[PDB]
Design a protein around this nucleic acid. Structure first.
Lengths: 140, 59, 116, 150, 112, 101
RNA sequence: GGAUGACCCCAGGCGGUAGGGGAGCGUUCCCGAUGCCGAUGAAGGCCGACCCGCGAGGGCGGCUGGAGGUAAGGGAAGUGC
RNA sequence: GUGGAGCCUGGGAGUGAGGGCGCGAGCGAUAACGUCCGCGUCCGAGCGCGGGAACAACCGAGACCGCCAGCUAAGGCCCCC
RNA sequence: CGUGAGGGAAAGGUGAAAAGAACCCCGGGAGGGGAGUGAAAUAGAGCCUGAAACCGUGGGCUUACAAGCAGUCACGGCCCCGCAGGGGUUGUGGCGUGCCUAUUGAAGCAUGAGCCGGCGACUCACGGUCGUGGGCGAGCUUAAGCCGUUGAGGCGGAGGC
């Protein structure tokens, strides 16, 4: 009978407070919301997931010794250009990245998966500039 | 020098895309105020012999 | 007598070349190149035919799973429920239900928590 | 007709390897296993020949297409003369005829007909029979025929 | 109506003329004549001769008006190359392809 | 009102007015078959378990056809194995007439 | 089952290099041919989303082409890149 | 025990560079993607399909074709998936 | 081409008939546009058919955050043919290590191949050995020749098995 495939719809804006939430145990979910696997009319090639505003990213909670033991990492393309920055220091300067880098590596690779990442808005909050979109609050 | 040489035939696409800057630009021209003919600015108009705005050149 | 190639080869070549229309550059211009893509096109169409049957099922199961967590339980439970219920509506149609006829699916969900 | 000189060195030319240009691998070259004059003749067992003539005539007779004649009315060479006679005999050229006779004159009359294949009796043979729809013979030919198959 | 003139077997190389033809495609016979005039390229001379010829044809055979002629379409095609020997170092002969162009120009009339 | 019916090993949701392609059934064109039902939908919502005892769906057999040709070709590298097969799938075209219960 | 290749039913086998075997396709040429097709268009070419064949292929149609072509059944090879 | 079992006679072969893995030894150094034998296996010829990130030979499984149907194997069921 | 012995090519086709395109127009010419001839002039002499590589022009779809053996699967958008369907294209998603050869093993950074077209390799003779379709069977068969034929076959027993 051919399978459903939806015509385009209005994307639902969602609000989430991090704060005390385990990084990535949270990120996991944001990812799902991004893809829209929570919507029963989900399509793989389409990008119909929610726009996800997270607020209070600075107050993400982490297990173990990772504050000073997880190291984020960037390579320029120069000799010795491997940059190693510890979690601590990441929170210390660009906190909204920590959750940003986590959600991304949980998104598919490819054109679309970069599209969905754009739909992630992260603010070491609270307060996000998206009063315009009226994001429905979500729990976990 | 050890006689360097193309490894692969350049594809038609890759070829022509070299030539995306090969296109000519038309001669820039203005009307000569006297005789009205088109000519390159800052030249003498070879049609009437005039430049600013006198006879310069017996044509 | 002599049977010169004559007409035969050109024809076997066009057959292939017509089969190769669409392909990038020489793959649609050069017979040989045509043949090599077509071989690959060959297996891919076979391999992906078999694969299409399991691409849709994974999709159905995604789509169903979502609809299932709307009513407060998971795909794996739900499916167990059906089997216990004795409901064998394939998940092609399970999917459709979940997206066209919410209510019926919601019926199916209850029979499923029921039989559990 | 070409020489047999090694067109160019076995090595170091960067070209492939070749001897002379008569090599069948050259467009100049000779053909590999091409026709040579042969002889397709072979000796078919006399008996088989004998049985075929036999069986060829048999089949035809089994179809009432065989017709023996005593002689040939007024055919004295002329083609229309033969026509006449053949008409009177049920031979209108709707059917094709192997006409077998040692009579020179009758053969000459029948010869130039398209629907007639003529033949002296020592010349009888299964093919010329099978080709033709209707066999028509002399008594005098019919004899030599039976003598061939004795 | 269309008038066309072709120059065949012009002993210039197609990729070189095409550069000049490419300038005047779609321009007003007036514009074209001008462009070609002060176009610094051997091809101009030739494209000119083809434009001009096609201009007459229009006016002269096909009842069209000079003040209305534009270049509806044009194109250069490759004709048979003149294969020439270029002797090189250490005994080797090279083969130069002096190339050959068929230059086409097709004039149409500008309605308004 | 729709039902979910089973035929040729697959299931489909059918409705009155549907032309539907199924695996070839042994059945003359113009004849008319009854498909078993595993669920009935809209207004009356009845969940066959696995089939709903009374129900059926009546369809008319418009006729039979052979689907568009599928080129099934296998190729094996470095081995000179190449097979070419032409495959047309036979089908039966159905006009769903009514639903029962 | 029928009565011997006619089809139907039922069951089982059907990855595959070297390689063995079996059934076909197409090319040139001969018999068929004093024939048949052919200018109301041969061969050949370019199309096709149509028909037949598992397939190699074969039709049918349109355009080109302008003088050849060659069946059912057989025969023989300079037979398929 | 009726199996692409077997035995007999004849036509045609290819093969006679193997390889990895498990196990048993010799050599080696209780080294080597080592080497040399034995039993077995798989790749060879299953570089077809699932797992193993990738990956001939480890696990799973011997692919006639089609399906937008169902049960499973190894492996898995946080997101990529 | 080679001092020479010697080596040794390529290159066939308008049409039924030259009726081989007067005259005019752009042009130094070449070429072309008209006119004219012709059943046909993309049969116009660079001439029958006019394949493919290859080069252009015009039209449709497409493409400047994208990762690739170039495809395939699915869905979607735009163009087209039509009026539950087709055709073209391809945005996104899944999947995906060219062909040949040689190899224990090749996408392989091992061989061969620029692309297209045409040429290119399991034959023939005489013996042999199985199989096989036939003929005849304690028998079977002729060879060279001769006669005949002018695509007609017959005779020939020497001989062989």
């Amino acid at each position: 009978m051919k399978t459903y495939v939806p015509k385009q719809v209005e994307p639902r804006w969602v609000l989430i407070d991090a704060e005390g939430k385990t990084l990535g145990r949270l990120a996991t979910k944001i990812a799902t919301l991004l893809r829209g696997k929570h919507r029963p009319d989900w399509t793989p090639n389409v990008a119909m997931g929610d726009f996800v505003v997270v607020v209070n990213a600075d107050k993400i909670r982490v297990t173990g010794k990772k504050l000073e033991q997880k190291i984020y990492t960037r390579y320029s393309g120069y000799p010795g250009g491997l940059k190693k920055i510890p979690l601590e220091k990441m929170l210390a300067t660009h906190p909204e990245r920590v959750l940003e880098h986590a959600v991304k590596g949980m998104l598919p690779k490819g054109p679309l998966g970069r599209r969905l990442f754009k739909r992630l808005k992260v603010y070491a909050g609270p307060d996000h500039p998206h009063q315009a979109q009226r994001p429905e609050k979500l729990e976990v | 020098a050890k006689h360097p040489v193309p490894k692969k035939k350049t594809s038609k696409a890759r070829r022509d895309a070299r030539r995306s800057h090969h296109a000519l630009t038309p001669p820039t021209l203005v009307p000569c105020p006297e005789c009205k003919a088109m000519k390159p600015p800052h030249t003498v108009c070879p049609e009437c012999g005039y430049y600013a705005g006198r006879k310069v050149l017996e044509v | 007598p002599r049977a010169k190639t004559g007409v035969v080869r050109r024809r076997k070549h066009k057959k292939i070349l017509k089969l190769a229309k669409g392909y990038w550059g020489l793959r649609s211009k050069s017979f040989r190149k045509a043949r090599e893509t077509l071989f690959a096109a060959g297996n891919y169409a076979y391999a992906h035919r078999k694969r299409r049957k399991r691409d849709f099922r994974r999709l159905w199961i995604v789509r169903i799973n979502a609809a299932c967590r709307q009513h407060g339980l998971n795909y794996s439970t739900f499916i167990h429920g059906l089997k216990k219920a004795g409901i064998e509506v394939d998940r092609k149609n399970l999917a459709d239900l979940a997206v066209r006829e919410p209510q019926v699916f919601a019926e199916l969900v209850e029979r499923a928590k029921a039989a559990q | 007709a070409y020489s047999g000189r090694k067109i160019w060195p076995q090595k170091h030319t960067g070209r492939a390897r070749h001897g002379d240009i008569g090599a069948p691998i050259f467009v100049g070259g000779g053909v590999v296993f091409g026709p040579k004059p042969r002889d397709y003749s072979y000796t078919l067992p006399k008996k088989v020949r004998k049985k075929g003539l036999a069986m060829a005539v048999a089949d035809r007779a089994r179809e009432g297409k065989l017709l023996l004649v005593e002689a040939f009315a007024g055919v004295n060479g002329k083609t229309k003369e033969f026509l006449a006679w053949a008409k009177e005999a049920g031979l209108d050229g709707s059917e094709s005829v192997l006409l077998v006779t040692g009579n020179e004159l009758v053969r000459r009359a029948a010869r130039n007909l398209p629907w007639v294949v003529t033949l002296a009796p020592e010349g009888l043979n299964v093919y010329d029979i099978v080709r033709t729809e209707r066999l028509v013979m002399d008594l005098d030919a019919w004899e030599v025929f039976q003598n061939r198959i004795g | 109506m269309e008038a066309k003139a072709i120059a065949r077997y012009v002993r210039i190389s197609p990729r070189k003329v095409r550069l000049v033809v490419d300038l005047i495609r779609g321009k007003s016979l007036e514009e074209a004549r001008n462009i070609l005039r002060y176009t610094n390229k051997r091809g101009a001379y030739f494209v000119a001769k083809v434009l001009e010829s096609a201009a007459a044809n229009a006016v002269n055979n096909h009842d069209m008006l000079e003040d209305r002629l534009y270049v509806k379409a044009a194109y250069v095609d490759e004709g048979p190359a003149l294969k020439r020997v270029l002797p090189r170092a250490r005994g080797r002969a090279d083969i130069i392809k002096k190339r050959t162009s068929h230059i086409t120009v097709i004039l149409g009339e500008k309605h308004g | 009102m729709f039902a979910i019916v089973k035929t040729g090993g697959k299931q489909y949701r059918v409705e009155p007015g549907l032309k539907l392609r199924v695996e070839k059934l042994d059945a003359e064109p113009g004849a008319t078959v009854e498909l078993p039902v595993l669920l009935l939908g809209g207004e009356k919502t009845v969940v066959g378990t696995p089939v709903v005892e009374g129900a059926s769906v009546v369809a008319e057999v418009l006729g039979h056809g052979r689907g568009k040709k599928i080129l099934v070709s296998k190729f094996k590298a470095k081995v000179q194995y190449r097979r070419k097969k032409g495959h047309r799938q036979p089908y039966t075209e159905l006009l769903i007439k009514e639903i029962r219960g």
